[PDB]
Each structure stands twice: as structure tokens, then as C-alpha cells.
Design a protein around this ligand. Structure first.
Ligand SMILES: CCCCCCCCCCCCCCCC(=O)O
Ligand SMILES: CCCCCCCCCCCCCCCC(=O)O
Lengths: 59, 57, 104, 267, 255, 58, 255, 267, 57, 104
């Protein structure tokens, strides 16, 4: 998926259940494979310490 | 003609500086310039969007 | 830092010997990983993300239990094998090693 | 200095700070106090080390070359360009246009080369570094009349003291250095495409003033750039693909990021 | 009492009206204006048509299929052969101008898709070969679509441009392209996207024929989908309007 | 850098209810995620990124 | 200028946000508060966590089929094993608290259904046998659905509870259950229902383990319907949030 | 300045300064004038040299290593830690938490090694010292692209001048350095136990910029720490048992003190 | 902007100092800071104990 | 900077092969001009404003099309000649080179 535009997409669908997990990942903004390549994550890779809050928007 | 400024200290001192050249590209760097304005990159819209109100009504 | 560097394991013959070398990479340590098992002269070698199977008696007997995560243990079998095994894990900034004594 | 967190309480109202539209660029300006109860916390953290000046103003090697005191290669030359290295180039390519004064530092070291001559009792070596502007005469050999440096700026250094440092004013015919150029130098649109068209920084020459011995000696010079008084405009995303050439942005397509095991995997 | 979803834009003898829209993005907070007297360098007087150029020009449409990577356009090169804007830039040596990009894509409630509309200044693009550089008429297209391509372009002795959508032809992450003014078209809500861009350059005026100030990109992050029965042909249309355009150095025509 | 003393946490997403879709519409949808910082973010200790690697002078 | 259909509720470290809703019902006009000094009887000081209990707890979902009678939950018994709310009530002898019930059921325009959400104080329920009384673990369910049943339960020597939907297990008309605070979920309009209930009892504090203050009931007056093709699995989810909870009489754990 | 002794006389009263209870911590605040007759004596002695700043602020070698200019060992590395030595460590372990700025000094000396090459006429050696922060790239070899030091702080030194000295600000994510930690890094409580968990000071790299000759040469670097602007909290007793390792407080049980001959013996 | 302070002399002189850096962690050490408070370690009790009176009455 | 440094030219036999090496001198580059054509060992050489005609098979076949202006191309003839031709143009400050592959 990393070699495709599919990596960005989170697939949701209709299932005969409830309470199933969609996704999950750890909170490591500079180190986690999920955030290492984002603008904020790339900026963090030039620094040793980080401290603040983090906004996550879902569309 | 010396300039006295403040040192970078922690929270919770002055230093002296004189310019010895006549070129203005010989001075030291400008490290204490703390000014931000993210209203250009973030919130770059025409009609102001209040936080509490809905985005598209 | 490998936990319990000085350890002695007593295992009966005819039972696979389990040797554990769990380690915790330092934040300072950010280099290529190398895991080497010595028998006191090598039984197995992990280097450049590749596993190589060295010792004629223990050939086809020594295999890893898991490495990238942080566990570099081995499970030996067909004990007859009395000796001291030194697990040496290498990171470019820092290095650590654990010695296990196996009886019978 | 950073903003301090305030204190909110339980709320039941029609206000919707969380719900918004990302179709518009409008990056939501919500704070934690809008989706939970918070306590008042004074924040003495200061946004000081993140400024562009503190980010860019550090010396960084951009090119190291060799020369000898005998034989064929007797002097060294290098057109001024910061794209030779990767670390300085990547940091500068966060922005489209930059405008900064430059501080130049050199590190010159010699090494006695293997030979078979005898009774080698060397003397102290002096080295001359000379700059040629876009259009100035260039030295054909190591004993050319160009080294007279009547107008070209030059510097002489005797091995053993503190390195030589000089400061250079913003040199450009434009109003800002351009890291990226989309276009051609020729109107017919058939020639060199890219930043190469805009670049014109001259050439730098380094050499031994004296031989100093009968045996061979090889000197090496390392150049260090420090941007001062920096201004920067229009930020752009960091380079993912590894660099290939110094003249262009030619790259090899690569993965957007590294891969894990599942979508619910925590490692 | 009206709805913020409705907008109208009037330029020259042209108008556009939207029933559903998000908002207007105004570049870097700057509204395009003319060149001041303390920032100019050319001596001779500029021409300013003011009405015959600053209007809406509508480029050719492009079909959005279920497997389209994306499209790109050079704003100076696109309006080169259209109306009096093209004629003025042809005769003159120096041209300075700003633009707006209204992208229209309308679908029904059942159709689901996502499009990213971003303007990239100095969007220099790389060649498939590491040694040579992209040829013109391969990177540039006159009123043409110029689509991208999933998967790398083959490496050989050919001035072909690397069209990978995930690297976007610039070697940077496609996701991080939100640093420049961007607007999202979500079929379920947004129908069109409006972006206003002020003139951005390191010099006061530049030769329009040999240099491109900005590159418009339309990239479908989420594909187009529907059920058997619904309409398959779904087009995207682009209209560009030069704002506060001025020209200098009149001479014989050509380039 | 990856550390165990200063650990972050975990971020997960579940179905509060179930996706409801009518007939003649697609039942397989997608979500997109954007990440940013609040007005209280800070960083320290300038260092060198581990991402870029230069084999030789280009 | 906003829409009254949008609401947000923030309690503790939890939030809920609705796109479509009716309103908020506030019990008997009373907003839940703490116990005054002229109404109290216990002498020793109360504990008030204030954040670790007063948040949103989300119970297990239930599938709404085309032939579901209805469901009921005991609010004190339901949060007995959930979070720190359960732990505090376990150690203490006396507990006083108020609640809110946000019920969420989302369906498409084509789906049609009606649900009645009502809170019943002292909802004593009858047994199938006329001589014996309903057994525990038959009337009560831990985080469990506890659905009703069309048609009478068989009469025999068994502590089974009468689950008739039309009598509701209390022997009263199901329609007249609108006397208590009630909210209606209409799939064609309302998506969720919010009810705020103040503490109601004949004494200042009561033992949570042996007594239930209120019973939440969800009853589909109009069945669920759709056409072949639309989604069949349609779930209902319930979140409860204790408000102004206080405890007294700390002792060894158990019940 | 110390207190001055006053003058008392003969006393017959019910007051009992001497008699007290050591069950309570209350260290008796009695002075000689309470149990004898004293004369008035002004005391100009000053408690100045005993302050924590004068106690800790002195340079102290913490680690010395070698490298060569040929062969296999071509550069040196050392994770920053003050527990390598015993004298600096014992003094710092009088307190639980310390907070101080650090002044760093280096002493680099070379030595010509035994060999059989001829005609060795060496040049001046230049050495580069580079710091890598917890997470920075580390040099695989002596000619790695890491030494470009675009952002990492580095220092260059030409053999023969005054040693190189730099000043380091309090670097910590906490509010004080911790000399002793009782706990684990992992919650499951099964891993590294001790201060090692908290420590994260990065790595230091030193090397020869140039070879300088055809014969072998071995250089050695010694590192010197000086704590400045010191603050200290919660004092604790000095180390009796000799140190064994650098990561932990592992020790061998030893005698409380030395022994004499009798209980009435004066020696 | 120079600071003039007192030199350490015996009992029974001024010196000048200027800060040349802008970092506040570059200055010299603080050697003349003579402040003590042993009432924490010694006498760490709740009820004050007078010297002359008995400890436990 | 020579345009299209990596190029492949397919020319039929009995047709003169046209090889183009157009270049753009840098403003920084102000030195004596040298143009050298290599066949992979030289077919032609331009140096000190003089053209020298090196390869026995291509003797009397290789000649320049135009050099001072900025065009240093050659027109070969009587193809039989499969090989790689490297056009190397030298200025005292900077140098560039273009390689052309010719089939048949
Ligand atoms: C002995 C005197 C030496 C003087 C040499 C001066 C050379 C100045 C070179 C400046 C190069 C600046 C390039 C910046 C390019 C960019 O930012 O994109
Ligand atoms: C060439 C630049 C070198 C810079 C190196 C900076 C290294 C700083 C190391 C600080 C270590 C302090 C450890 C204190 C531990 C304690 O007090 O318990």
C-alpha cells in the first residue's frame, strides 16, 4: 500500500456486528512509521524533545 | 557606543555588544527574534470561521 | 541492556534447552543491529537482517525463538552440549552481552 | 512563549467546536479544553529554538577537495554551490526563496605521501585561497599571473593557526535566492531546465604558495557554510526520495513510508 | 438571511455562481494588487487592459474514471493560446499577474469521491532518466489534461517526465502537499473549489513564455465509486481568471 | 526517538454503532486522517535527521 | 447562526456530538445537584470523585430486527462492573447519584422505524407465577440486553419474570408510559435521544446493590422496515453518565 | 560568617540544656557556654569554601580513550556518563537530585607508534570532536557522510594551541538530574532496574581529520567535566563499599570502619 | 554595562565583570553565595523544642 | 551544460549518422575551449581553435557540423560503426559530457 495512494485511505464497511476495530496506532509522532513522514513528524526528526498537544481530524 | 541586551535564561541577566566592522554583514546572527504569525498557513480563508459555530450552514 | 547477564540454566538431557537473551535498546543507540551466539566457536549469527546456520555438532539443532522487536533467544535440542553460551548483541553506539552456563 | 492551558468544566450546549469541514483549508483552531475538562496550567515553554535563524545558522560542510605540491594536480577549483552535500541542501529546501548573508570557514590539512626520497625535512606550508567572480580570469596553471589578486578577494594562511573565516554579503541580482526554478534560460524552451539556469556564484581556487620539502605532500580543504541574517518565504514539503544529481531534482520513486504488519498493529 | 453555501464571482463580462461550495481560500492572506512605485524596476510605462484579460477562461474538461491518477496544468502555459491574455503576453517581454482557480465537479448523493485541489509555486518536475532533464511538450500541455501515472515510468535514454502520483513528479510526499493553499472537493458535500493566488516570485516581473509561476494539481485521494445504473461519465472542469495583470517591454510578436 | 521511560499511549477507533447504507448505494467507504499541532507545541535540541543519506558528492 | 439539530455534551474526559437530534429532556424540570446540609442524615463526610465517575460509559449494543419486542436495563445494576463507578459503590454502604441516557440509532432515509425511550423510577416487575416473585439474575442483567417478549410467559413453578411488551412487565398500558420523561427516535428525523434524570427517592441516600432507582426502556412502537438491498444489521447503542455522584459509609468490599 | 562565642559564668538553676531526648530527631542546639564558663571570642572565620558551588565546581577527568590514523580502530566513541570514574561520582552522590550547567574541556595528545617505515616527516594533526543527540545518525566508518555536522555540534582543533572548551546548558526532560532511581523503565516490572533507565545523554565521537604521515600514530583524548550553577536537594550518606559497575549500585559488603586493639586504646 | 562587585579578602577591594555571550549558561560560576538554613535537617520537629526546658515533660 | 547527456540514436546503414552535442557555457566558466569526441579511442579533436582529423576506420568520415557559437556536433558516414560516442566539452572552470549509443 506504501507504493500506492491506498496507504492514506482507512476502509470502513457494513458488517453484521458492532464494536469491531477500525484502526489503531501508538502515539509516537516522530518515530512511529505512521507519522514519521508527515510535515510535523519530519520537523520533529530535527529535534530531540517535543512537548504539546496533537490534533487529529477525520473526514 | 555599546548595546546592552538581555541573556537567554530559564523561567520559574544583561550582556554587552559592540560592532567592530563597518559592513553590517559582519555582525553576529539575530538569534533573539521571537515573532510568529500562523494565520497565513492555518485559517487561510476569506470569510472568518468562528470555532463554535458550524462550518457550513 | 541485556537482563540477567550472569545466569545458569540446568536442563535435563532429551529436553530442548531454552536459552533467553532479551535486551532493551538505548535511545542513544541508533545503529545497525548484530546478534551473535558464542559457544565456549559460533553456533548461529544474525547480521544485516540475515540469519546464518557454524558448529557441526549443533548444526540443524540451533534456531532463534523470535530480533527486531528486542528478543534474541535460541532453542537448542538433542542435548548430549555442556558449555557456556555468550549472547552478544551489538548496536553502533553501545554493546551488551549475556553468558549462560548449561549443565547436561 | 507558548500559550497556557485554561480550565473548563462540564458543558451541555449547541456549540460544536469539534465538528467542522476539512473541505475548507481552515485548520481547526480547537484546544483540549473544548472536548474535555481541563485544569489551569501556566506554560513557561518558549518557542525560541524553532525560529528559522536558529534552524539554519550552523556551519555545515559542503565540499572537500585535494591538491598536491608536485606533479600534475597542483591546485584545486570548485564552483560555489550548496547542492553538493545532502544535509545542508535538504534543510534549505524547506522553502522556495531564501535571503541570507554567508559566513565562510575553511579547514586545510596536509599529509606526507608514500615515496622513496631521503632526507625530507619539510618547512611550514602556506596556502592561498582565491575567489573568481562570474567573468573573472581563471588560472591555467599553478604559477599563472592570475594569483596576483589585484581585485579578486583572496586569503593566505600559514599552517598551524586558527582556521580562516570571512563574511560574505547577500550576492544576487534578484531579491531572494531561489531553491527551486520551474522554467528554462532560453525562450525557445529547449536547453537547460531547472535551477541550474539561475545559479551564478563564481569559482573558488586553493593551492600551495610554497613546496616546503623534496617529498610529496597532499593537502585537503573542507569548506563550511553558515547562513546568517536569514529570511525565508513560501514553505514546501521535505525531500522523501534520495538525491541523485546536483543540478536537478531527478529522483527514483520510493515508498511513502515504511510498512508494519497490520492496520491495528502497535509496532 | 442567506446560506454561506451560495457564492457568486463577477470578473469582466463573466460570472460564476455556486449552489454548494466550501469557502474561498485567499492564498497566503494576500489579495492580488498592482505593482507599487517603490518595488518596480522597469522604467517604461505598463499597459493594463483591466477587462479584456481579467475574466474567466474555461479549459477543456477531463473525465474522472475509477482509475484516474490525477492531472496537472501550468497556469501561464495554459492561457497562452486563449483570448487577448495570450496575445498581450506574446507581444510583450515582461508580464506580472495573479490568478483564481474555480474547479467544478458535480455528482449525485449515491456517487462517492474525494479530490485535492492545490496550487504549487515553482513546481519543478523530475525526468524518468537520472542523467537528462524533462523535455518541453512532455511536461507542458496546451489546454491539455497532462494526467499522472500510478507506478514508476521506465528508465531509458528518453526525456520522459516521472509521472508517479505518490511522489507527484517532485519527489515529495503527495499527502504533505497541503502546505500550499489547498481546497478539498467531497462529492457528498463540496461540489466546487475556489482558490485565489497572489503573484509570487523572487523578482518584480518575469518572462511568461520561459517561466511558469504556479502549477495546478487535481489528485483523487479517494476513488470514484457508484452502483450499476448511475451515470458513469463524470467530468471535471477548470476555469482560470487572471487578476491585476500588467505588461511591459512591447516588441515584435513571437517567442 | 523510541523510548520506554517516556511512552506515549495508544489511539484506537471502533464502531460506536454500525454503518447504515440504503439500496443502490456503495456500502464500502473510506475515512481520511489529518494530523497537526495545537497552540502549545514546542521542540528542543537541534539534531540531524536520520532520513537523508549521501553516498558521495553529487 | 447555527442549527438547533446539532448538540455536544462534555463530561469528564468524554464527549458526544450529534448531527441530528430532537432536544434534551431534563427530567422533572430539575437539574441534578449535590445533597444540601439541611436534607442530609449521615454524619460522616462524603467522598466526591467528580471526574473519575461522572463520565460516559458505553454499554453493549443490541440488534434491532424486524420482530424485536424491546429491551430494558437497570441503571444502578448496569454500571456495577464498569470503571471506577463500580469500584466506589462496591466499597461504600450509601450512594446517591443522577444520570443521563444518550441512545443512538442511525439509519438511512429509505429505512423507517420508531423507538420509545423512557426512564421508569421504581419499575417493579411481576413474575409469570402469581404465587412466587421474580428471581434475581432473571430480572437483572450485567451489561446485558434483557429483551421483552410478545405473548404471555408460560405459568409454572419457576421464578421467571412476565416479559409481555404490551403490559411491559408492570401490568400497565405500554402507551401510557409517556407519563415519565420520554423521548421518541423517528428514523426519518430523530437519530438519537438524550434524557437527564435527577436523583429520585423517598430517602436521601440508598444502598445501590440491593435497590435500583430507575429502569431504562427502549420499545419499538413501529417496526423496522426496508427493501431488499439496504443494510439489515441495525444496532442500538446506549451510553450512561452518572452526574453529581457522592458516596458514604466506607467499609470492606463486597455485597 | 560563623557565630561568635559569648561569655557565661557560674550557674545554679533548674534549666537543663544538656539533658534532652535523642528519640526525637531534634539535634541538640547547645553551645559550649551552656556546660562551662566561656569568654567572649569574636569569630571572623567564614563558611565560604564549604558551599555546594565551591565543592563541585572543579574540573575532573571522567573518561580517556584512544584512536589511530591507520588500521582498524580509526575513531573513538563514548556515551556521555559521569559514572565512569569514582572521584566525580562519589562527590555527586552526596545528593539525590542535582541541577547544573556543564563546562566541557578536552585534552588530545598523539604518540608515534613503533614501526619499520622510513622517512617519516609528519605534519600537524587536526582532530574533530562530534556530538550525536539521543536519536542522531552515528558514523559507521571514519569517512562516513555523518561528519558533515550540518546540525550536530562539533569542534575542530589543531595540535598545539590551548585545549578546546565549550559550555553546555542543563539538558534534561525532568526538573533535576537524578543520581539514584528506585524503579524500572517497563511497567510489567521485568527489565533494567536502576538509574540506567533514566540516563539519555547521547554519544561523543573523536577522530583524525588528516593522517599527517606514513608511520603509525595513536592519539588519546581525555574529557573533563565542570559543574556550574549548581543546585542540589535531599542529601544522602557517602559511599563506603568500592564501586563495581557503571550502571548500578552493585557492591561487596565491607567493614563499617577500621579496627583498633581495645575499646580504651587511643590508637 | 559592567557589574562591579567585591573581592574575597581576609578580615581583622572591588572587581569588574562583563558578560560577552548571550546564553546565560556561558557566564562564570557563582562562588559568592553565602546563605545557610539548617533548620530543615537539624530540629525537623513539629512542636518547637526550647533548649532550656525539658524535652519530654 | 550539454542537453540530453544520456541519449540513444538508431540510424540505418548507408545513411550518414548525425550525432548532436549542443552545450550552454556557464557565466562562471571563462577558460580555453576544448571539444573531444571519444568512440568506445578518439575520432576527432578540437583544441586551441584547431580541428584535427585518429581512428583509421572513421578517417575521412568524421567531420564537425558547425563550435565557438556553442554547437559541437559531428556527421559520420559510411556506417557498417556500432559503438558508444562520448562528446566531452571542456572549459577551465567547469566540464560536461554527453554519451550517444548508435545501433547499426
Ligand atoms: C577568498 C574569498 C572567498 C569568497 C567566496 C565567496 C563565495 C560566495 C558564494 C555564495 C553562494 C550562495 C549560494 C546560495 C544558493 C541558494 O541559497 O539557493
Ligand atoms: C562537540 C560538542 C560536544 C557536546 C557534548 C555535550 C554532552 C553533554 C552531556 C551531559 C551529561 C550530564 C550528566 C549528568 C548526570 C547526573 O548528574 O546524574
Amino acid at each position: 500500500k506504501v507504493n500506492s495512494m491506498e496507504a492514506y485511505q482507512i476502509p470502513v464497511r457494513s458488517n453484521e456486528g458492532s464494536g469491531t476495530q477500525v484502526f489503531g496506532f501508538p502515539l509516537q509522532p516522530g518515530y512511529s512509521s505512521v507519522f514519521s513522514r508527515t510535515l510535523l513528524g519530519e520537523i520533529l526528526n530535527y529535534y530531540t524533545h517535543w512537548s504539546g498537544s496533537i490534533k487529529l481530524t477525520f473526514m | 557606543g555599546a548595546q546592552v541586551s538581555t541573556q537567554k535564561t530559564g523561567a520559574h541577566i544583561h550582556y554587552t555588544n559592540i560592532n567592530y566592522y563597518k559592513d553590517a554583514a559582519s555582525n553576529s546572527a539575530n538569534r533573539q527574534d521571537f515573532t510568529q504569525d500562523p494565520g497565513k498557513f492555518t485559517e487561510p480563508v476569506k470569510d472568518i470561521m468562528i470555532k463554535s459555530l458550524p462550518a457550513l450552514n | 541492556s541485556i537482563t540477567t547477564p550472569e545466569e545458569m540454566i540446568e536442563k535435563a538431557k532429551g529436553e530442548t534447552a531454552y536459552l533467553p537473551c532479551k535486551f532493551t535498546l538505548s535511545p542513544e543507540d541508533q545503529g545497525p543491529l548484530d546478534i551473535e551466539w558464542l559457544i565456549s566457536q559460533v553456533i548461529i549469527l544474525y547480521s544485516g537482517d540475515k540469519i546464518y546456520d557454524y558448529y557441526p555438532d549443533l548444526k540443524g539443532r540451533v534456531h532463534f525463538t523470535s530480533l527486531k522487536s528486542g528478543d534474541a533467544s535460541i532453542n537448542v535440542t538433542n542435548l548430549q552440549d555442556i558449555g557456556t553460551y555468550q549472547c552478544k548483541v551489538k548496536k553502533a553506539p553501545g554493546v551488551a552481552n549475556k553468558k549462560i552456563h548449561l549443565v547436561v | 512563549r507558548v500559550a497556557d492551558t485554561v480550565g473548563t468544566g462540564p458543558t451541555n450546549s449547541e456549540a460544536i467546536p469539534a465538528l467542522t469541514a476539512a473541505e475548507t483549508g481552515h485548520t481547526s483552531q480547537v484546544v483540549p479544553g473544548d472536548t474535555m475538562q481541563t485544569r489551569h496550567v501556566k506554560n513557561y515553554h518558549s518557542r525560541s529554538e524553532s525560529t528559522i535563524e536558529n534552524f539554519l545558522c550552523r556551519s555545515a560542510c559542503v565540499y572537500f577537495t585535494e591538491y598536491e605540491n608536485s606533479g600534475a594536480k597542483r591546485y584545486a577549483e570548485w564552483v560555489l554551490t550548496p547542492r553538493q552535500a545532502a544535509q545542508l541542501r535538504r534543510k534549505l529546501e524547506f522553502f522556495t526563496y531564501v535571503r541570507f548573508d554567508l559566513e565562510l570557514t575553511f579547514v586545510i590539512t596536509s599529509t606526507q605521501q608514500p615515496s622513496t626520497t631521503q632526507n625530507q625535512d619539510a618547512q611550514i606550508l602556506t596556502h592561498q585561497i582565491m575567489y573568481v567572480p562570474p567573468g573573472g580570469p581563471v588560472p591555467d596553471k599553478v604559477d599563472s599571473y592570475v594569483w596576483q589578486t589585484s581585485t579578486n578577494p583572496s586569503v593566505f594562511w600559514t599552517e598551524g593557526n586558527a582556521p580562516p573565516r570571512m563574511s560574505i554579503p547577500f550576492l544576487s541580482i534578484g531579491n531572494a535566492y531561489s531553491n527551486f526554478y520551474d522554467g528554462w534560460s532560453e525562450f525557445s524552451r529547449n536547453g537547460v531546465y531547472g535551477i541550474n539556469t539561475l545559479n551564478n556564484m563564481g569559482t573558488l581556487y586553493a593551492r600551495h604558495v610554497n613546496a616546503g620539502s623534496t617529498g610529496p605532500i597532499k593537502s585537503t580543504i573542507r569548506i563550511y557554510f553558515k547562513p546568517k541574517h536569514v529570511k525565508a518565504w513560501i514553505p514546501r514539503p521535505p525531500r522523501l526520495c534520495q538525491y541523485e544529481k546536483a543540478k536537478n531534482v531527478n529522483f527514483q520513486p520510493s515508498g511513502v513510508t515504511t510498512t508494519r504488519q497490520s492496520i491495528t498493529t502497535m509496532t | 438571511g442567506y446560506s454561506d453555501r451560495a457564492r457568486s464571482i463577477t470578473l469582466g463580462n463573466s460570472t460564476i455562481t455556486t449552489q454548494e461550495c466550501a469557502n474561498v481560500v485567499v492564498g497566503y492572506g494576500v489579495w492580488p494588487d498592482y505593482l507599487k512605485d517603490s518595488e518596480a524596476t522597469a522604467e517604461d510605462q505598463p499597459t493594463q487592459p483591466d477587462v479584456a484579460t481579467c475574466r474567466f477562461y474555461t479549459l477543456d474538461s477531463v473525465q474522472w474514471q475509477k482509475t484516474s491518477p490525477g492531472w496537472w496544468w501550468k497556469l501561464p502555459d495554459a492561457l497562452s493560446n486563449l483570448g487577448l491574455f495570450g496575445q498581450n503576453m506574446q507581444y510583450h517581454y515582461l508580464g506580472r499577474t495573479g490568478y483564481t482557480v474555480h474547479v467544478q465537479c458535480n455528482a449525485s448523493k449515491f456517487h462517492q469521491g474525494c479530490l485535492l485541489v492545490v496550487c504549487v509555486p515553482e513546481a519543478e518536475m523530475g525526468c524518468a532518466t537520472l542523467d537528462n532533464t524533462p523535455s518541453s511538450a512532455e511536461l507542458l500541455g496546451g489546454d491539455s489534461a497532462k494526467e499522472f501515472a500510478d507506478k514508476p515510468v521506465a528508465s531509458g535514454s528518453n526525456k520522459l517526465v516521472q509521472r508517479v502520483v505518490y511522489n507527484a513528479g517532485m519527489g515529495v510526499g503527495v499527502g504533505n502537499l497541503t502546505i500550499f493553499p489547498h481546497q478539498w472537493i467531497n462529492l457528498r458535500t463540496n461540489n466546487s473549489a475556489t482558490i485565489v493566488m497572489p503573484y509570487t516570485n523572487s523578482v518584480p516581473m518575469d518572462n511568461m513564455f520561459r517561466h511558469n509561476n504556479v502549477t495546478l494539481m487535481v489528485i483523487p485521494f479517494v476513488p470514484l465509486d457508484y452502483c450499476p445504473g448511475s451515470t458513469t461519465y463524470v467530468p471535471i472542469t477548470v476555469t482560470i481568471a487572471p487578476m491585476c495583470a500588467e505588461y511591459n517591454g512591447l516588441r515584435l510578436a513571437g517567442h | 526517538t523510541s523510548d520506554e521511560y517516556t511512552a506515549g499511549g495508544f489511539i484506537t477507533c471502533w464502531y460506536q454503532t454500525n454503518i447504515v447504507v440504503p439500496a443502490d448505494a456503495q456500502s464500502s467507504c473510506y475515512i481520511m486522517c489529518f494530523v497537526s499541532a495545537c497552540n502549545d507545541f514546542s521542540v528542543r535540541l537541534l539534531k540531524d535527521t536520520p532520513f537523508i543519506s549521501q553516498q558521495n558528492f553529487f
